[PDB]
Amino acid sequence: QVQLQQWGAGLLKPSETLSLTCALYGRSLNGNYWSWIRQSPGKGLEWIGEINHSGSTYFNPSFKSRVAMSVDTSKSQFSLKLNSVTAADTGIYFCARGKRYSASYSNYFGVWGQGTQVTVSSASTKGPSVFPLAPSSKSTSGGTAALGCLVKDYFPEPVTVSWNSGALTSGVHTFPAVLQSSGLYSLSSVVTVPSSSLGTQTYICNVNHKPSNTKVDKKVEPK
Amino acid sequence: DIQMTQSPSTLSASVGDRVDITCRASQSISRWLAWYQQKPGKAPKVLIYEASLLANGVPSRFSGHFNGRESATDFTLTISSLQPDDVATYYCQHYMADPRFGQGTKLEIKRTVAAPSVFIFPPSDEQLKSGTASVVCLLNNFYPREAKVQWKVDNALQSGNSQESVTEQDSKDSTYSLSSTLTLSKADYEKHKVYACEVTHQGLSSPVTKSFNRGEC
Numbered sequence: 001q002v003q004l005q006q007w008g009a010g011l012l013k014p015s016e017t018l019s020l021t022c023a024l025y026g027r028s029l030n031g032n033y034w035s036w037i038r039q040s041p042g043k044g045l046e047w048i049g050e051i052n053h054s055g056s057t058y059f060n061p062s063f064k065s066r067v068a069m070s071v072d073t074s075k076s077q078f079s080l081k082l083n084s085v086t087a088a089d090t091g092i093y094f095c096a097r098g099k100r101y102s103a104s105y106s107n108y109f110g111v112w113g114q115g116t117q118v119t120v121s122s123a124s125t126k127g128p129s130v131f132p133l134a135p136s137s138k139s140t141s142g143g144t145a146a147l148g149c150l151v152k153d154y155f156p157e158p159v160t161v162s163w164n165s166g167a168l169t170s171g172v173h174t175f176p177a178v179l180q181s182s183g184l185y186s187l188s189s190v191v192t193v194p195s196s197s198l199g200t201q202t203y204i205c206n207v208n209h210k211p212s213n214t215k216v217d218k219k220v221e222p223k
Numbered sequence: 224d225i226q227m228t229q230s231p232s233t234l235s236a237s238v239g240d241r242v243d244i245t246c247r248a249s250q251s252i253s254r255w256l257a258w259y260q261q262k263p264g265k266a267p268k269v270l271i272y273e274a275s276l277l278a279n280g281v282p283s284r285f286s287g288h289f290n291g292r293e294s295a296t297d298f299t300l301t302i303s304s305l306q307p308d309d310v311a312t313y314y315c316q317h318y319m320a321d322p323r324f325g326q327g328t329k330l331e332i333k334r335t336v337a338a339p340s341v342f343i344f345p346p347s348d349e350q351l352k353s354g355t356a357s358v359v360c361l362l363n364n365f366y367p368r369e370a371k372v373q374w375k376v377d378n379a380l381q382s383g384n385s386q387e388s389v390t391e392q393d394s395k396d397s398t399y400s401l402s403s404t405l406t407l408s409k410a411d412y413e414k415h416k417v418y419a420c421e422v423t424h425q426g427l428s429s430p431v432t433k434s435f436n437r438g439e440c
Contacts, residue, residue: 035322045267045314045324060321094266099318107318108257110278112266131347133359138435139342146342150350150357150404173363173400175388176263180406187388188402190361192340223345 002026006095006113008080011156011211012120018082022095022113029053029076033098035109036069036080038118040091050098050107051078090120119156123183127214128154130207133188134223140195147198147220148190149205153182154212161189162206198222225249227315229325237333238397242302244328246315251294255319258287258300260311261327263391267314274298282306307332308394332397338426339365339401343419343433346412356412360420360433362401364393371423372403377415381405412437 008020022034029052036048049059051069059067068081082089092115099107133139133148140146151159161174174189189205207216226249236242246256254274259267269278271287274295284306288299302309310332315325339362346356362370368389374381385405392399403420419434 044326045316047322047324096266105253105255105318107322108269108272108316109259109267110269110272112268115266129350129353131350131357133344133361134347136344136435138433139344139361141340141342144340146340146361146363148344148359148361150347150359152350152357173390175390175400175402178386178388180386186357186386186404188359188361188404190363190400190402192363 002111004095004097004111004113006093006116008116010116010118011125012085012089012118013122014086014120015084018080018085018089018093018118020080020093020095020116020118022078022080024076024078029071029073029078031102032100033107034071034078035096035098035107036093037096037109038089038091038093039115040088043088043091048080048082085120087120090118092117117157121156123155125212126153126155126184127209127212128152128159128207128216130205130216130218132218132220133190134220135195135198136222143195144192145195145198146190146192147203148188149207149218149220150186150188151207152186153180153184154186154209154214155184156211157185158211159185159187159207159209161208163189163191164202164204165206168203224323225252225317225320227317227323227325229315229328231328232326233329233331235331235333236305238305238307240305242305242309242330244300244313244330246298246300246325248296248298248317248319251296252317252319253293253295254289255317256287256289256298257316257318258285259314259316260309261314262311262394270313271300305330305332307397310392310394310397332392334366334397336426337364337366337398339363339370339422339424339431341420341422341431341433343435345418345435345437351409351412354409356407356409358405358407358412358418360403360405360422362403362422362424364396364398364400365424365426366398367425368392368399369425370401372401373421373423374403374405375417375419375421376407376411377417378419
């Protein structure tokens with residue numbers, strides 16, 4: 001039942017400050033240091049620094065000129081600030097449980113937050129358009145039909161797609177997002193289903209673009 | 224700092240195969256080494272710490288090895304018999320000083336050839352009101368990953384106006400899926416009739432074409 005949940009703004013312009021918070025459930029912060037770790041496509045996994053329940057900190061020297069961390073024990077929360085961001089700070093940022101006071105050499109990471117995607121860009125937030133990929137006879141095969149949703153023209157990442165409010169998971173493929181020539185992302189989510197069901201089953205793609213607070217429920221019907 | 228070098232960059236193996244991945248520290252780190260598994264879109268999960276101790280919940284097919292000496296620099300992660308859910312990138316990390324990670328090893332699964340099922344989708348009327356038309360070609364549940372997808376409009380080969388995306392390898396059946404998306408202006412879409420995607424793949428004896436005609440029942 002021990003878990004870390006994190007949040008914070010994921011679109012920043014260059015020179016702005018990154019601010020993230022992590023919340024711990026199922027135990028208190030006492031007894032461990034708590035770390036921030038990021039992952040970028042070009043530099044891989046990088047440890048940023050750590051803090052304990054008393055607010056003592058130690059930072060990777062590569063970040064010491066720009067980083068701050070704080071802790072609020074009354075909320076079992078801890079925070080990261082990274083000043084003066086550049087494109088080199090785009091990446092996925094994770095909080096994690098680190099070393100235990102009871103063991104000097106124990107700074108591996110056994111519990112992690114879910115990650116926050118941070119994009120440093122001049123481009124503005126934009127929510128997606130959602131269009132049906134309608135099943136047809138040009139989309140059927142030996143009793144199997146394919147259908148989907150095109151999630152187009154949004155920024156930044158990420159978007160989440162579910163089907164039928166989460167009730168439909170078998171046969172779903174949600175493609176990695178790709179940047180279009182416009183500079184906006186697009187992806188499709190598809191699912192294969194019995195062609196026997198097109199007759200009678202409702203298929204809804206539920207799209208959530210949290211960066212723009214956009215939600216769309218698109219019904220996908222044969223044309 | 225102490226730097227970690229992982230080898231190989233990528234590894235392909237079949238289900239049931241033994242797998243070895245290695246990590247070298249730039250100076251001695253004793254047993255202060257952890258191994259992680261990461262799936263796309265998720266946090267890493269620890270597999271091994273103290274170089275050879277399995278973490279809770281980790282299946283017995285994973286093991287960690289080193290020479291057992293305080294001077295150790297060289298470490299191995301072994302999967303005795305690979306399972307389909309093991310497709311992932313694997314990372315080492317030392318904690319002899321400031322934590323540092325290796326660059327990762329991407330583990331891919333080899334399986335039998337599977338031809339794609341091919342589907343084509345016309346643009347929606349809703350989208351056409353915006354001035355653009357997207358046409359989507361889906362290649363579903365195939366292996367290996369390499370495929371060629373060519374678009375034709377009224378049988379004229381298209382270049383420069385399509386993009387592809389490929390899924391992560393499936394953790395149950397080890398297949399890939401692929402989307403190819405053709406972007407046209409509404410005017411260009413309305414002026415032409417036949418829209419076709421042509422797919423070449425190892426599992427197809429000859430290329431498959433899926434097509435539709437704009438405005439057909």
